[PDB]
């Protein structure tokens, strides 16, 4: 299948910091239909995952603009503008261009 790689594993940050999470795919995620089915989910401490950004750069309803996704082919990146306590949790990248649908193992954003 398609292996999703996230770096780093743990990311200590201070409130107000700027940050970027990288996600690399083992295969090109551009679907034959011309769409890139790369997504980002946030799992706050003790919660269930939540859709953050869909199809590389589209923010889901209720998602602040401090979140921006970019990337293409196999390299993608999530940028957080001004880290706030509510951003703490585990970020996972996910692809649905290929079956099986696969996920990365997450990046833990920690208050340093």
């Amino acid at each position: 299948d398609v292996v999703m790689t996230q770096t780093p594993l743990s990311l200590p940050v201070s409130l107000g910091d700027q940050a970027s999470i990288s996600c690399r795919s083992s295969q090109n995620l551009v679907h034959s239909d011309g769409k890139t089915y790369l997504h980002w989910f946030l799992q706050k401490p003790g919660q269930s995952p939540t859709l953050l950004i869909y199809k590389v750069s589209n923010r889901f309803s209720g998602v602040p603009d401090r979140f921006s996704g970019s990337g293409s082919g196999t390299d993608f990146i999530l940028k957080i503008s001004r880290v706030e306590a509510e951003d703490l949790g585990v970020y996972f990248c996910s692809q649905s261009t290929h079956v099986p649908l696969t996920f990365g193992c997450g990046t833990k954003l920690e208050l340093k």
Binding site: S48, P49, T50, F92, T102, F103
Partner: protein
């Protein structure tokens, strides 16, 4: 509103049937999913069923052993699990994605139900 139930501790080779009750949305216009998070925190897609149950798909490691259905007792999604391996331990969540819009699979998630295959 998605609530999963049915999870527990079983032994390898066991069977378990998970349930996900829906509420607050139309159900018949949502693809349903089962996703599990391993003790390592990794997320693994388990299965998918379209609105109407006309199409279903599973992860290979699960094919034949697991069985998904959105039967109707009252807005329910099911996952019958058999031949349980230790590799199946994790928190199972059901999730959904609206049919009319194109966002991301598993647009919404439930609270989770843990299943531990051991001893």
């Amino acid at each position: 509103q998605l609530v999963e139930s049915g999870g527990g501790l079983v032994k390898p080779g066991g069977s378990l049937k998970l349930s996900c009750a829906a509420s607050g949305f139309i159900f018949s216009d949502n693809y349903m999913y089962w996703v599990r998070q391993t003790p390592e925190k990794c997320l693994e897609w388990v299965a998918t069923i379209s609105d109407g149950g006309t199409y279903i798909d599973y992860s290979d490691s699960v094919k034949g052993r697991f069985t998904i259905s959105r039967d109707n007792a009252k807005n329910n999604l099911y996952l019958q699990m058999s031949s349980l391996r230790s590799e199946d331990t994790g928190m199972y969540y059901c999730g959904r994605s609206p049919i009319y819009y194109d966002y991301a699979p598993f647009t919404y998630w439930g609270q989770g139900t843990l299943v531990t295959v051991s001893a």
